[PDB]
Amino acid sequence: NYCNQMMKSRNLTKDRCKPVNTFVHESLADVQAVCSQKNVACKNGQTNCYQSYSTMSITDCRETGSSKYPNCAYKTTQANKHIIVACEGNPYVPVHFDASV
């Protein structure tokens, strides 16, 4: 199970079961590039979010209804969608995954 393996390997099941998380099957440089693409509002009202012009191969990991810490368990859903990330700093880089659309 991809999500069980990746959520564990990436520390997302050690301190708590992260209920939902998205993985992006693209290069880091192509995700960092989104920070100079379409400027959009974030869910929180801040305007440091950026939407990719293109769709990207992504995987959504979501905890099952019965899952509980420490035995975290996930269902995997594939999608090809535009990403929205919050960007910050110098260099101006992704710091949060806001949504897929």
Binding site: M6, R10, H25, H96
Partner: peptide, 15 residues
């Protein structure tokens, strides 16, 4: 004390 950028990569990147 990962930076936010480093945490984003660890949490979301799968090249």
């Amino acid at each position: 004390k990962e930076t936010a950028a480093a945490l984003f990569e660890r949490q979301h990147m799968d090249s």
